[PDB]
Design a binder for these strands. Structure first.
Ligand SMILES: [Zn+2]
Ligand SMILES: [Zn+2]
Ligand SMILES: [Zn+2]
Ligand SMILES: [Zn+2]
Ligand SMILES: [Zn+2]
Lengths: 186, 585, 72, 525, 297, 187
RNA sequence: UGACUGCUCCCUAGCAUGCUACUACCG
RNA sequence: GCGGUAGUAGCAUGCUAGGGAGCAG
């Protein structure tokens, strides 16, 4: 607390008391500057008491409202923080069966129901064009989620069944292309 | 908790008495608070004395209790004035830069929007000022419309007519369809489903857009929305590329639009170009020419309406293949030839209403004069594209300023880009006058158009001159004059071939009186461009600043292919117009 | 490494939950079942298959734009 | 019908990444994650309420229950109770739900404010002449656990708690304020509370072993006769304040409100067959009375079912003979023999009882001869007096006293050296502490800097792990300390880059060195 | 619990206790009322009386604020604070007080016992919330009036249209006819049920019961009273004459049986209120029925 | 503190003191005009520092009675709420079917568990699986509690309607399966 | 939609009390 | 030269109250 007026008065008083004890002056005339000096910390150490209070009162109100602001903007971005966190941890996992379906989804082949785990149940995947059909489907086998699925039905987007070897390249601008392959786990 | 307008430093205070409550910076917030009655400021909590049941709400009027804010009449012995130090107490109290002269900001905030000075502020301001300004206009005007009664249809007599009253204490909304209502019906408890309506000279004439038949207690108000803040600028800091790189130079071209290809070539060498588009100068044709010139463009066709982008979709599939166009119509009946609800589309037409936010290729904006700085930043807030174009002209038509009172604002400061073709010059032009002949076009060129638009064709002496006076007498929100309405048939009679025309008139209730006299259809003066006949009868019925100002019914005179009627009772511009004059019977 | 799977299954069910998937009773029942069976597994090669089966429940909607969030 | 689900917990990715930075969660480590937030689907509430199908009508051996009630009451002589006026009750946290239908209009604060002390006293004195049946909501809990079974508590209406408090609170707070007793509710575990409790339960038992059991589905399988006995023992202190009809009508109100009440689950009213409502005003103490009752009757069964000719200590034979007479031949209480059996029990079978959790230090060479209860005796007693089978996989036994209870209130015990002498510290389960760090409701959990006061408490509970012989266990505590340091010196960093002003002085360096936590387990305070 | 005071309309919490109707009074305004009357007891959320166990003092200025209580000087703790001081009595909202310089209008209504015509010159020539206070004070003190009288016990029954009837002790007697209609009710062993609407006149007691009934022994009557609760709207709105009879339905056809009527209604739709000069049998009952057809809407 | 009797006294004491000190007349000048000021700490001794302690107590008492006024308004509000709930839930009571069963009771007391049984006009069955649906709510009408109920709306866990044609055997796995069959007492 | 208890840490406020210093008056 | 009371500040302990959190049955 160096930049307050009471500090100047205090400096003056202490210079005076130094002149006193260094001059070996009097008994009551050097009793002048502590009935007029120790009072100079009676109204220096109090004005410099309450403002030193307000000092940290302000900071403990500012940090309270900072924590309030942070907590109210944290619970208003959950929908996105959660998804970005999920996908960071996903690409950190580095699993082939998950990367397969995530790449497929990012281009086109999304499933239409929960990928079943038994050596039996049906899986329905949307193949959006032919280029994609090349990479996954080769004849009768369907490679998706790091497994094999014998195709049993592939049907165009206008709900009309389309048997298999009908599908190739320039004969593909022939069908409503969001095809829907059914298959069974190997 | 964001960045303040006048400072861009991260702050937490929002001016409470201020209408739109922008983030304000500690020193910068204090500067705003020292010069207004905007003397309430909200932080994470509002700065008001939370002593149980107090009244004080000015900011400097309060001191920091510990966990609270109090007035002097409540402050604990240990207090600390909130507003001091030349810096109001809030988060980030260190990072504050201010602006020495913010009376620009205070002026926008203390702007109640009455005079043209208000919109001189709104444009000649600085940027986040500009978005604050446009958004303040909109906010106070949607608060405007609902200071008015609830339009109760409380008896029903016949069709196209209603028995209608309103609520108590409130003045009444005006007469026509810039203020379209959208009422909704009740049951026993709450409010569900009527439609889009407006009430005019009857007896209450209602022009419902959709089919419906109304009952008792049926009420209407201009249902409002919540204008939420804007983001992108009105227009990016643009610049002209060094070669048209990234854009696809095509080999073959259509010389139907030989007035077009030299216009596109540098547009790919540049960010934005707003074009000088006089009425019917192939402007709707213009953007469709580049459509073939650069068929590889995801080109952003936007207008003030699917009544205006309607015109952009007029020759859409007539010139482009079908499935490559699309328009987003939100859950309004206009054009629906397209596939709807497909943003990822090669050609996406839409209005500023609801094209969702993406990134595209070259923007083409119809209706630039009537739209202002608000929706100006909308398309770029919508979309960060390759390059930009605005079709239209401040030489058409401003917006209806519900609160501007004293002395209509310039054609020139319609918006931030509208000054540019009057301070930088026209980026494009089209003088291809497919529509009007030598009759009117250059007489509009000697008007405001730089002596710039050439003759189309001969001058068949079919657009007309009548030197009259008339007598007008007022009513609610119209003006009715039959000394000129009497001239209308008096004009329309001496050849029954006259009356194959559409009536033009400002005070369209003056057609609600004329339609019963003639059977002639109606022409709205301001919502007219894009629609026209070769034959149009016009009674300007007023010479006031509402009426015969330079560029309003300017849009009405140029409606004719060859033959309009102008009973210019005004001495405003009659001293100019070069048409066939006869005696007045 | 199994702990990574259990934590990401927690996160996955959270994001499914705020996608309003619990408004489809049988779907939410299967997701809850998979999530609780991942947290109890003891060999990481069945937790991984139940994890792909659980993630497919998210990849089958149209609420989370996937290509933008694989910004890599 | 309403179908209530349970959400999954929020992941605190920063603490998890920090933990794996310090080399945690490596394959083949001992400390691993086992406590999570298990999510539950729609029909999880009622599928849990349906567990009341485990409550069957049980008749009790009356001539033995009437003796066990005397002994159990003798276990409760040290306290004092009675009715209190409405201005003497104490309600910590007035902002908790008020049951049904009162939770439509406000929390308990509204109903404790709107009724003056005279209204509350009129209501209380009304229930000594009338029966007020009430409704009870059933609520699912949202908390970390190790098993995916849903949890559920009984939100009892304010009209029941408001009066049960005035009936019971004097005794309930005289129980929680006594040290050295058998019921150890209220005794803290810090500042040498754990060491004092264990040295008290090991009073002077000659061949001491420690024993602990487990009540399967304790709250839903508790017969109604034992609940009634528990309440009658808690109401034995009203011999001057209340009259006889008053005591009966208060017992009837208790049964009508928290025993066979109408449970409001989903959106529907069902009947509760019996067993304790886990959220009533006296659960943690009625459970203790029931616990002591079962232990006493296990001892009675173990002593009566022994070939009397083979007992060698001719005092215990005469005690068995007198015990049979006092049960089946006498008809009124025999206070001298009640005192004598209670003394025998306290000598050879000392207990430490919390609300259905228990430790026993017992004379091994007596239990070997069937003169006090073993664990097979508890198995038999629960089989025929509780309708549950207690498998010996949940009951532990310990023959070395220098490593105390294998478990008590979910804490293990370690005999460590403090200062100059050896004390008993309670350490938790490392997976529990790590799990409370990683999984939490959002903002409580995901960003630490908003709440370091959390990790300080978690490190308070995780301190004794520093003294474990295993080394990953200690690393749990040091990880928590380093995480608190990181949280603090990044909070100041954020509020410096958000500022130019920060902590001129703090004195929060205490929170990342052990002398602040050590002090919570040394006895002065 | 807390509303706006009459003479001030500021939000107060103080109700004059000795005053009959007890209207909300404003701190300064309440003090003005208390300085000129014996209305010297004032209730806030709690009554301002010395709550030292078993005291007697109840005047307001007679008390000082003793922490959680109010005490007399004979009870006040060393640390006290006089309630009624500062020209402003201690209550909630002690800052928002405006008063009226001359409230002896209000005190006059409150100190009005309603004996002379001057009382009702007060009741009308007063101001407004004064007016509702006045009318309500009249009613209150008159339903307290009627029950200062005996319980009309029919204690023998002789013939029909006649009763043997006495009353209670010490009380004068209600008058003779039917502006003071009784409504007695009968007992059983315990409490008080039905009898009906009756009045007693010159016999021998002539009773003119409205409904059919036959009375027994012990049968008693008093003028059973109600609870006059306060009154909101003004006696009459600040009215004004419209510019056209808009919103009202001009009908085409009319009945000239009431040709003295239609010119009377026409501006009534052009105006808020009209009280009419209605001399007896001047088609006044006919008058309102004419508009019924003129404006059947 | 400026408007008190002690402030004027301080002003006069110090005016005299500094006047005679600038005069600098005597040692009695400083002695008396420094012992009178020292009664200047007796001046505004408490005329400014014990009352200030009342400006505490009055503030506190006013705050407490503010709080109590609220607490008494919340009470009246909750009273209105409770009683309007009672008076709106009784009007559902169906008062002919339940006045008839009560008058047959010998004393007027009937068990509660039979009042919805004998006098409710609407039933709501919750069915977990189709097989249970077969033994109970089969057909468009069924019988229960010795009465005859006719089915109306049938909804599943997602509260969407199910037509009775879909509750087959093999179609069952496509239904959210705790169906809520609501029915009406027939006559 | 959030029960009944028990313990513990952190922050703030109030009051008294207790301790110490500075100043003042009087004896 | 001492005592006393009054003031003020600093400091401590304790009690109550208010809020945030953790663990346990
Ligand atoms: Zn402002
Ligand atoms: Zn205030
Ligand atoms: Zn009692
Ligand atoms: Zn009065
Ligand atoms: Zn008194």
């Amino acid at each position: 607390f160096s930049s307050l007026p009471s500090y100047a008065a205090f400096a003056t008083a202490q210079e005076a008391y130094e002149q006193a004890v260094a001059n070996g002056d009097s008994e009551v005339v050097l009793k002048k500057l502590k009935k007029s000096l120790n009072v100079a910390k009676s109204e220096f150490d109090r004005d410099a008491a309450m403002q030193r209070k307000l000092e940290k009162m302000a900071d403990q109100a500012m940090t309270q409202m900072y924590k309030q602001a942070r907590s109210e903007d944290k619970r208003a971005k959950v929908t996105s923080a959660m998804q970005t966190m999920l996908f960071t941890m996903l690409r950190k996992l580095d699993n082939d069966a998950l990367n397969n379906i995530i790449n497929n989804a990012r281009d086109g082949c999304v499933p239409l129901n929960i990928i079943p785990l038994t050596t039996a149940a049906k899986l329905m995947v949307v193949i959006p064009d032919y280029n994609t059909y090349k990479n996954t489907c080769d004849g009768t086998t369907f490679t998706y989620a790091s497994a094999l699925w014998e195709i049993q039905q592939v049907v165009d987007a206008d709900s009309k069944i389309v048997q298999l070897s009908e599908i190739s390249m320039d004969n593909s601008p022939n069908l409503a292309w969001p095809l829907i392959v059914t298959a069974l786990r190997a | 908790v964001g960045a303040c307008v006048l400072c861009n430093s991260q702050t937490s205070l929002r001016c409470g008495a201020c209408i739109r409550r922008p983030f304000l910076c500690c020193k910068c917030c204090y500067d705003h608070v020292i010069s207004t009655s905007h003397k309430l400021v909200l932080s994470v909590n509002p700065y008001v004395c939370n002593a149980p049941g107090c009244d004080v709400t000015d900011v400097t009027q309060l001191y920091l209790g510990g966990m609270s804010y109090y007035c002097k009449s409540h402050k604990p012995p240990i207090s600390f004035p909130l507003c001091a130090n030349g810096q109001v107490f809030g988060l980030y109290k260190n990072t504050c830069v201010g602006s020495d002269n913010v009376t620009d900001f205070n002026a926008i905030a203390t702007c109640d929007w009455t005079n043209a000075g208000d919109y001189i502020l709104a444009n000649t301001c600085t940027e986040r000022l500009k978005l604050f300004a446009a958004e303040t206009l909109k906010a106070t005007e949607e608060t405007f419309k609902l200071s008015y009664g609830i339009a109760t249809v409380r008896e029903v007599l016949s069709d196209r007519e209603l028995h209608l009253s309103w609520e108590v204490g409130k003045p009444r909304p005006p007469l026509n369809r810039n203020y379209v209502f959208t009422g909704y019906r009740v049951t026993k408890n709450s409010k569900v489903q009527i439609g889009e309506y407006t009430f005019e000279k009857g007896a209450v004439v209602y022009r419902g857009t959709t089919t419906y038949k109304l009952n008792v207690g049926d009420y209407f108000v201009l249902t409002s929305h919540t204008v939420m803040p804007l983001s992108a600028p009105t227009l990016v800091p643009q610049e002209h590329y060094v070669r048209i790189t990234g854009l696809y130079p095509t080999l073959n071209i259509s010389d139907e639009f030989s007035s077009n290809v030299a216009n596109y070539q540098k547009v790919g060498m540049q960010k934005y170009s707003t074009l000088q588009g006089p009425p019917g100068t192939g402007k709707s044709h213009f953007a469709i020419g580049l459509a073939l010139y650069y068929p590889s463009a995801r080109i952003v066709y936007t207008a003030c309406s699917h009544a205006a982008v309607d015109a952009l979709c007029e020759k859409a599939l007539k010139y482009l293949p079908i499935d490559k166009c699309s328009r987003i119509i939100p859950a309004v009946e206009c054009f629906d030839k397209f596939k709807v609800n497909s943003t990822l589309e090669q050609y996406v037409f839409c209005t500023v209403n609801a094209l969702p936010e993406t990134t595209a290729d070259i923007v083409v904006f119809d209706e630039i004069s009537m739209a202002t700085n608000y929706d100006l930043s909308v398309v770029n807030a919508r979309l960060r594209a390759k390059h930009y174009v605005y079709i239209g002209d401040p030489a058409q038509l401003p917006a209806p300023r519900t609160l501007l009172t004293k002395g209509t604002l310039e054609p020139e400061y319609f918006n931030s880009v509208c000054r540019l073709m009057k301070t930088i010059g026209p980026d494009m032009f089209l003088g291809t006058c497919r529509r009007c002949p030598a009759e009117i076009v250059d007489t509009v060129s000697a008007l405001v158009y730089d002596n710039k638009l050439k003759a189309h064709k001969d001058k068949s002496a079919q657009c007309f001159k009548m030197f009259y006076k008339g007598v007008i007498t007022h009513d609610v929100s119209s003006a009715i004059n039959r000394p000129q309405i009497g001239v209308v048939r008096e004009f329309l009679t001496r050849n029954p071939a006259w009356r194959k025309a559409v009536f033009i008139s400002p005070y369209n209730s003056q057609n609600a009186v004329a339609s019963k006299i003639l059977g002639l259809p109606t022409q709205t003066v301001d919502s007219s461009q894009g629609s026209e006949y070769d034959y149009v009868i016009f009674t300007q019925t007023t010479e006031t600043a509402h009426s015969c100002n330079v560029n309003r019914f300017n849009v009405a005179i140029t409606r004719a292919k060859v033959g309009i009627l102008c009973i210019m009772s005004d001495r405003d511009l009659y001293d100019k117009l070069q048409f066939t004059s006869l005696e007045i019977p | 490494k199994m702990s990574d799977v259990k934590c990401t299954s927690v996160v996955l069910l959270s994001v499914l939950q705020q996608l309003r998937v619990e408004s489809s009773s049988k779907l939410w029942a299967q997701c809850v079942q998979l999530h609780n069976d991942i947290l109890l597994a003891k060999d990481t090669t069945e937790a991984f298959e139940k994890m792909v089966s659980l993630l497919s429940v998210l990849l089958s909607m149209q609420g989370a734009v996937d290509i933008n969030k694989l910004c890599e | 019908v309403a179908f209530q689900t349970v959400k999954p917990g929020n992941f605190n990715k920063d603490f998890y990444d920090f933990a794996v930075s310090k080399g945690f969660f490596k394959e083949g480590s001992s400390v691993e994650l086992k406590h999570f937030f298990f999510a539950q689907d729609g029909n999880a509430a009622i599928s849990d309420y349906d567990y009341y199908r485990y409550n069957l009508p049980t008749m009790c051996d009356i001539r033995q229950l009437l003796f066990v009630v005397e002994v159990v009451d003798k276990y409760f002589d040290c306290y004092d109770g009675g009715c209190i006026n409405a201005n003497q009750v104490i309600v910590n946290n007035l902002d908790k739900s008020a049951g049904f239908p009162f939770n439509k209009w406000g929390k308990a604060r509204l109903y404790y404010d709107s009724m003056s002390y005279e209204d509350q006293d009129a209501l209380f004195a009304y229930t000594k002449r009338n029966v007020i049946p009430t409704i009870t909501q059933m609520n699912l809990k949202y908390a970390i656990s190790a098993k995916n079974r849903a949890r559920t508590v009984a939100g009892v209406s304010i009209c029941s708690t408001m009066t049960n408090r005035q009936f019971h609170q004097k005794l309930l707070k005289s129980i929680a304020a006594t040290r050295g007793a058998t019921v150890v509710i209220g005794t803290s575990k810090f500042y040498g509370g754990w060491h004092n409790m264990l040295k008290t339960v090991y009073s002077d038992v000659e061949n001491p072993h420690l024993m602990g059991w487990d009540y399967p589905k304790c709250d839903r399988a508790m017969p109604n006769m034992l609940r009634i006995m528990a309440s009658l023992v808690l109401a034995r202190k009203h011999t001057t304040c209340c009259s006889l009809s008053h005591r009966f009508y208060r017992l009837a109100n208790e049964c009508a409100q928290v025993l066979s009440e109408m449970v409001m689950c989903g959106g529907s009213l069902y009947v509760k067959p019996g067993g304790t409502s886990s959220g009533d005003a006296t659960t943690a103490y009625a459970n203790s009375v029931f616990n002591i009752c079962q232990a006493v009757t296990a001892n009675v069964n173990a002593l009566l079912s022994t070939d009397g000719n083979k007992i060698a200590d001719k005092y215990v034979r005469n005690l068995q003979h007198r015990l049979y007479e006092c049960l089946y031949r006498n008809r009124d209480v025999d206070t001298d023999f009640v005192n004598e059996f209670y003394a025998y029990l306290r000598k050879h079978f000392s207990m430490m009882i919390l609300s259905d959790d228990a430790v026993v230090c017992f004379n091994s060479t007596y239990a070997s001869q069937g003169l006090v209860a073993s664990i097979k005796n508890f198995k038999s007693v629960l089989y025929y007096q509780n309708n549950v089978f207690m498998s010996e996989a949940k009951c532990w036994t310990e023959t070395d006293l220098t490593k105390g209870p294998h478990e008590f209130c979910s804490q293990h015990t370690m005999l460590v050296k403090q200062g100059d002498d050896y004390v008993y510290l309670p350490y938790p389960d490392p997976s529990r502490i790590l799990g409370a760090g990683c999984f939490v409701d959002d903002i409580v959990k995901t960003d630490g800097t908003l709440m370091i006061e959390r990790f300080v408490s978690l490190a308070i509970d995780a301190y004794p792990l520093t003294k474990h012989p295993n080394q990953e266990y200690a690393d749990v505590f040091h990880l928590y300390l380093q995480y608190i340091r990181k949280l603090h010196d990044e909070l100041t960093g954020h509020m410096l880059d958000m500022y130019s002003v920060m902590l001129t002085n703090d004195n929060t360096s205490r929170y990342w060195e052990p002398e602040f936590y050590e002090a919570m387990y040394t006895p002065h305070t | 619990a807390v509303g706006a005071c009459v003479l001030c309309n500021s939000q107060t919490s103080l109700r004059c206790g000795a005053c009959i109707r007890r209207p909300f009074l404003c701190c300064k305004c309440c003090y003005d009322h208390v300085i000129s009357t014996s209305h010297k007891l004032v209730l806030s959320v709690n009554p301002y009386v010395c709550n030292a166990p078993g005291c007697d003092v109840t005047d307001v200025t007679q008390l000082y604020l003793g922490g959680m209580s109010y005490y007399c000087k004979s009870h006040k703790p060393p640390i006290s604070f006089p309630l009624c001081a500062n020209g402003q009595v201690f209550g909630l909202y002690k800052n928002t007080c405006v008063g009226s310089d001359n409230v002896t209008d209000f005190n006059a209504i409150a100190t009005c016992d309603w004996t002379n015509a001057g009382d009702y010159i007060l009741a009308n020539t007063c101001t407004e919330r004064l007016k509702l206070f006045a009318a309500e004070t009249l009613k209150a003190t008159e339903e307290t009036f009627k029950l200062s009288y005996g319980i009309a016990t029919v204690r023998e029954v002789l013939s029909d249209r006649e009763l043997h009837l006495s009353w209670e002790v010490g009380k004068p007697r209600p008058p003779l006819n039917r502006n003071y209609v009784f409504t007695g009710y009968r007992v059983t062993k315990n409490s008080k049920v039905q009898i009906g609407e009756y009045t007693f006149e010159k016999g021998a007691v002539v009773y003119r019961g409205t409904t059919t009934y036959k009375l027994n022994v012990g049968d008693y009557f008093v003028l059973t009273s109600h609870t006059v609760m306060p009154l909101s709207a003004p006696t009459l709105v600040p009215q004004e004459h419209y510019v056209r009879i808009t919103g009202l339905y001009p009908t085409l056809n009319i009945s000239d049986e009431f040709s003295s009527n239609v010119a009377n209604y026409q501006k009534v739709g052009m105006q808020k209120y009209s009280t009419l000069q209605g001399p007896p049998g001047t088609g006044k009952s006919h008058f309102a029925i004419g508009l019924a057809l003129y404006y059947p809407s």
